[PDB]
Design a protein around this ligand. Sequence first.
Ligand SMILES: CC1=C(C/C=C(\C)CCC[C@H](C)CCC[C@H](C)CCCC(C)C)C(=O)c2ccccc2C1=O
Ligand SMILES: CC1=C(C/C=C(\C)CCC[C@H](C)CCC[C@H](C)CCCC(C)C)C(=O)c2ccccc2C1=O
Ligand code: SF4
Ligand code: SF4
Ligand code: SF4
Lengths: 140, 740, 124, 80, 180, 98
Amino acid sequence: MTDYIKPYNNDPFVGHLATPINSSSLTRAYLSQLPIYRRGVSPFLRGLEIGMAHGYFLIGPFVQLGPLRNTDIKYLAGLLSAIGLIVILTLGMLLYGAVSFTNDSQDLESVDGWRQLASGFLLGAVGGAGFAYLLLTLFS
Amino acid sequence: VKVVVDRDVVPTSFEKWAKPGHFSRSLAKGPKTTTWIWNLHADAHDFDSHTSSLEEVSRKIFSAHFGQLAIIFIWLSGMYFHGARFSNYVAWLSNPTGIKPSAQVVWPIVGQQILNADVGGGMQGIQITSGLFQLWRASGIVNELQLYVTALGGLGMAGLMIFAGWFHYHKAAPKLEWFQNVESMLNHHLAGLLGLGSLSWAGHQIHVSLPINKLLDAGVAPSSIPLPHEFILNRNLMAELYPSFQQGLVPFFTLNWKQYSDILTFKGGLSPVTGGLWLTDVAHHHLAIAVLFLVAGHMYRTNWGIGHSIKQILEAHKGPLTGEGHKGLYEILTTSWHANLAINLAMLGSLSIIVAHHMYAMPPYPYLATDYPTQLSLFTHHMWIGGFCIVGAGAHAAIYMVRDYSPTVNFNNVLDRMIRHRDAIISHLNWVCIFLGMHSFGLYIHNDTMRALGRAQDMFSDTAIQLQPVFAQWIQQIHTLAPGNTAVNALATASYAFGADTVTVGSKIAMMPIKLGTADFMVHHIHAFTIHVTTLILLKGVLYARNSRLIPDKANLGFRFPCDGPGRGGTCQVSAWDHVFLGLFWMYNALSIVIFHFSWKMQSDVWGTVTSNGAISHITGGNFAQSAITINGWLRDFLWAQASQVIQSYGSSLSAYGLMFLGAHFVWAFSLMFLFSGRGYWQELIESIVWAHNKLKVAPAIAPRALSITQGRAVGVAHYLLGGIATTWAFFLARIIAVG
Amino acid sequence: MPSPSFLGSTGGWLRCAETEEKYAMTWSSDQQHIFEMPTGGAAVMNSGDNLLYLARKEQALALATQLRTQFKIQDYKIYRIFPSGEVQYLHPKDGVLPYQVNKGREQVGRVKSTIGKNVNPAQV
Amino acid sequence: AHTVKIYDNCIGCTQCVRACPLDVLEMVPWDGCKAGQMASAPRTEDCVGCKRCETACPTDFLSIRVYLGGETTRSMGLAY
Amino acid sequence: GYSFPCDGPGRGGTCDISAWDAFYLAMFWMLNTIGWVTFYWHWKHLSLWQGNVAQFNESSTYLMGWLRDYLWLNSSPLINGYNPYGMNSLAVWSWMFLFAHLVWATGFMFLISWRGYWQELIETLAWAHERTPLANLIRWKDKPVALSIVQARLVGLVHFTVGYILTYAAFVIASTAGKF
Amino acid sequence: SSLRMFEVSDGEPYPLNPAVIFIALIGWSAVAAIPSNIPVLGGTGLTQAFLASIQRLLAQYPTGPKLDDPFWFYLIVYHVGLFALLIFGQIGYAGYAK
Ligand SMILES: CC1=C(C/C=C(\C)CCC[C@H](C)CCC[C@H](C)CCCC(C)C)C(=O)c2ccccc2C1=O
Ligand SMILES: CC1=C(C/C=C(\C)CCC[C@H](C)CCC[C@H](C)CCCC(C)C)C(=O)c2ccccc2C1=O
Ligand code: SF4
Ligand code: SF4
Ligand code: SF4
């Protein structure tokens, strides 16, 4: 018994190696459950949900606050700016795999699986901008 | 707790004064360099850079305490003198409105007599904004004789402190054991100083209030004012002015406290006669604070065995995220004279700011709210004082990790964690600063773009309704309904800045329900931006002062060092004292924006005039309902319209505030000489002048050298602040006199 | 090897530290003590040699300088290369660098005037 | 990286390796000095160039020069 | 050579010693001296355009006349480019005058504070980069470092120049076209 | 709408969903702040909104503060009582064993 087990194991058994607010022991498992870095899957699916999450809310800001927000046409300004930025952002994200070229044997996190998740990101972003598009139409 | 005195340690001799630099053998044998001339004064107050014997360091700082204390007493004893020899306080005592304040006269030498401002009362001079007349009126002082007696009584107390700081030293000297009695120290500071101080002044404004309250507020001449001793020598006079004095400390023992309700009340708000807070509420206030401090002054171990102690109090506080928490903090504060100074400078610095806010919010002195120059000056005065003090708190909280922190002696796992996950603290504050910057000032860029672009500012009006009157509006409404409901014993709010539509006017507006709007959310977040950046850089200098990732051997170099060299791409300005040097600058920007906000928003919506045909007409009538949202309005309607009151004064008596205004930019831009150039070029610049000095041998024995790398930056911030305060000092004292 | 325990993270689990060369020091430590890392708070020093990980070279030499001032102990630092190459760069002579040694040699030494002349007559 | 060049002004008072952070220089027996030591920098690949030896260098004009050259990971002193 | 930081912070200090440092010092005097000549030349025409020559040879003798009648009176149509009521033609210029004081004061970031503080801060940013989940998958190419001691002063001189140039390039047009 | 009781291991989503409900009650107040969106949302709900909507600080908006004040008062009473229990929990809890 040296120092009586590290002053109470640094208070009631902390541990938590990959936890300190980066992702709790529940949240790190929630990240493994989270599709952006999902286990047991490859081509398209690691992405796809990425776009279905990003493009889904990209309609949000420019509908109420964008440079166009005072007439009836303004329901479209939230989507045109979003889709234009979606094309720009898709190019910017796809270019990362072109910059990387060291792990050509590790095709998942480098080039192959990288493009095989951004491919789902393109349809996810555009489609997700179209998914939240038809959600506020029946109430208007 | 024991009388341990080391009588006679240092003799009384002029021998040390004969040697320039006796405090250090390194600053005595080699005065062959110009740099030594500046090192003699730079280290003159760095007492921990001489001897390490704490029994002598404690016997060199308590000496400086009594020395500074004597300087302050010499300073205060003159204020009562200037308000008697040449002033207008008695005439202002009879006529307070038409007679402007003044307590400084000039002489006919070079035509400077134009500064004699026509204030009235048969005396000309220079207007004052120190609040001396309000304090003296709130003290019951009427005759000039009461000024001279207080001044002559101040000379005695000023001399006794010099003969005290020269007593416990060249004559006496307590041991080192007398300083670890921090337990016995807080029992005499919270009870002897705070306690008896809040009680002694409380017992004064109970018997001196009626020469101000039940006399000077009725309409009696200053000659008809009775004497303060005539009220005490005859208890029935106090009994008639207050029908509670007939008892004379009889229900005080009977616990029939309600019979003392003629002086002890809790009204709230302001008085519609004087112009400030109630003269009876402050007496009861200080009585309430005095008893609380008489209780709070008994908390630590003396020599009877009862009570807590800073030791086991901190040895008991734990916490999950803290680990070995709070323990060792006793050894932190009881060993380093420095260590107490940062927590003092931090608390007292924020205290000066908080009391500055409490000044304008609820004016405690009579005839203070209407006196706009004094009010505006005093707020920003304590504002900048606390700015310097909090940065000094960072300046020394950076000293601690370098000068008095050890990995074996003093230990708190809390402070350990502040240095173990140290890269996380500043990372959080960094992202917070950037989020509060790219938006608060980003929205400034946004709105200034919307106006020059066209119809975008028009569609911003709905967003101008947002944020503003959305938050903090309900807080004011809570305070509107706080009396009666959550304050049954209060017939008024905390201040009339809370009570809506309730305006108190004494020919000039005293307070207003400060209706937030338009851009208060903007400037408050400019504040929070400049506050988080200031806290970031200073806290960075605090916890990165010991362990640094770039250079691991950081403790060897020091605190006020230049850098390391051109290696590692470039190690430049990495000292914690430089985080304070730049910390002074972000504090400078913070306090500058806060004084701008306070000052201008006042006359925008608060300060104004009143007529019977209408209601309220401000000096500048509701301008920052739009001119605050953009950066342009801060120099289109703010920094531009102010030149009509600072420059258009040469034909009057306000010409000095224009000369100091235009001359403060000189010394500020003079700081741009040191904050931009380097010692290398300037050192190549001397040797040419020294060549001309070697041509005629007129070269001094003291070899001409450039300023130190650190001393140049210390002088640079000195001028950036002096030249960066005297301009707004001349500006705050420019318009407020013309529009007073 | 038994090494001092430290909490606070920061230093470990860095990708750059994994892909970049790392430094490994050691010290005798004849007695239980408590010291401070050049980049961390405080930690208890255990008996026997203690192996740690360092990401910088100056960090690897400042700790040795700090240990020499405490008590008198010989220091050993080993500098590893990216793949797995482990070379003894600290004390290749095993004699302290300020003190005189027998194994002498000259690397990159120009023996010319002092104002300048940057050309080197011979590199070896 | 940086280019270390030793002047002929050396006295051998070991001021380099005393000041030097990561031990770039090294004391070597020499036959043309008073104390008999000469500074030599074999590990110039690891040199950072912090210029703290020129401070401790005694001579009127310093004896240990390090001319600023290229910059690599070894000369930037970065941990990442 | 020409562009190098210092010789070493020792022997009193070698801060700003290269010939390039002399150039970077010289540009500051260039802007202000060449601005003095222009501040003078801007009155030798606006005093006769208004016909009131008695303003200059009577008030320009002291600096306060240079402060109240030029930096304040002539700037009325400048700042009134977009008043809180009806904005007109001098809006784009009144905006540039502000965007100028931004860029100019932006240079004060690169000139007053040096480089090492940014090294110690960028290292914390890089630490937060890999430590943060999800964002840990993103990796850069060239290691993030601060500007060179020479490039720091050069880029900051670029800001101190173009901000000052735009500071005077927006006042002239609006202030002269507002009153003619 | 339901009790949502099932498993003892379901006792850790029970501190999870109200942990989201607190933030949800905050976000609901945040999203309904625009001075222009309130006129269009309150018409269908109330019979009083037909004649005129928006009661400013007269009744409906004080209900928020009149919902906070009781909750604050509840928590104040319970902690003042907890300080008088002198180390003995007198309130039942659905814990211990599983
Ligand atoms: C001017 C300057 C100097 C030189 C500064 C000097 C020489 C200070 C001069 C101040 C003294 C007080 C002036 C000389 C006056 C004598 C003391 C004589 C006075 C005798 C009577 C008048 C009392 C630097 O060392 C420097 C370093 C780094 C960056 C910029 C600079 C810089 O700009
Ligand atoms: C912020 C800052 C940095 C960091 C600067 C960085 C990281 C550069 C950031 C550049 C970003 C990517 C934006 C660059 C784009 C510009 C807005 C315009 C440039 C486009 C062309 C002109 C090239 C320093 O390196 C520095 C060094 C010495 C003194 C002060 C400072 C300093 O203040
Ligand atoms: S710095 Fe120069 S003189 Fe001193 S020991 Fe090294 S080589 Fe010799
Ligand atoms: S160049 Fe720098 S690291 Fe190398 S020996 Fe000289 S001072 Fe030391
Ligand atoms: S001499 Fe000047 S430029 Fe060179 S490293 Fe030191 S502070 Fe930086």
